[PDB]
Write a protein that binds this ligand. Structure first.
Ligand code: 92Y
Length: 108
C-alpha cells in the first residue's frame, strides 16, 4: 500500500521499538555494492563508507574502480566498486523530534 509524505504511520525508532510517527518526506537513498578482495560482496554500503574518495561530492566510483571501504568493525578493506542502488525510502519523525530514514518494510 502506497505511503505518502504527511501520513501518520508506525515505524522503527532509534531505540529499536515501533512508535507512531509522521512521514516527513519521500527520499531516494543510494546504497553501494562492492566486491571485496576475498570474493565476497556487500550491497548495503553507504557512500560515506568509501574512504578513498568523496562520493557525496563527486559521485560514485567507476565500475571496477579499486576503493577503500570502512566496514562495520571500523576496519578499512580494499574492494572494487560494482554498482549504485538508489532506493525509495521514507523519512519519518517521532514525537521526541528524532528523525530516521526507513525502508518500506519497516513502515506499518
Ligand atoms: C561481505 N563479507 C562477507 C564481509 C567482508 C568484510 C569483512 C571481511 C572482508 C574482507 C575483505 C578483504 C579481504 C578479506 C576479507 C571485508 C569481507 O569478507
Amino acid at each position: 500500500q502506497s505511503i505518502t509524505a504527511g501520513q501518520k504511520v508506525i515505524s522503527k525508532h532509534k531505540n529499536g521499538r515501533f512508535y507512531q510517527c509522521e512521514v516527513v518526506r519521500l527520499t531516494t537513498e543510494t546504497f553501494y555494492e562492492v566486491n571485496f578482495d576475498d570474493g565476497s560482496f556487500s550491497d548495503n554500503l553507504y557512500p560515506e563508507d568509501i574512504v578513498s574518495q568523496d562520493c557525496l561530492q563527486f559521485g560514485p566510483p567507476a565500475e571496477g574502480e579499486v576503493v577503500q571501504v570502512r566496514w562495520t568493525d571500523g576496519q578499512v578493506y580494499g574492494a572494487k566498486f560494482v554498482a549504485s542502488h538508489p532506493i525509495q525510502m521514507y523519512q519519518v519523525e517521532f514525537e521526541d523530534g528524532s528523525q530516521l530514514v526507513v525502508k518500506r518494510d519497516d513502515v506499518y
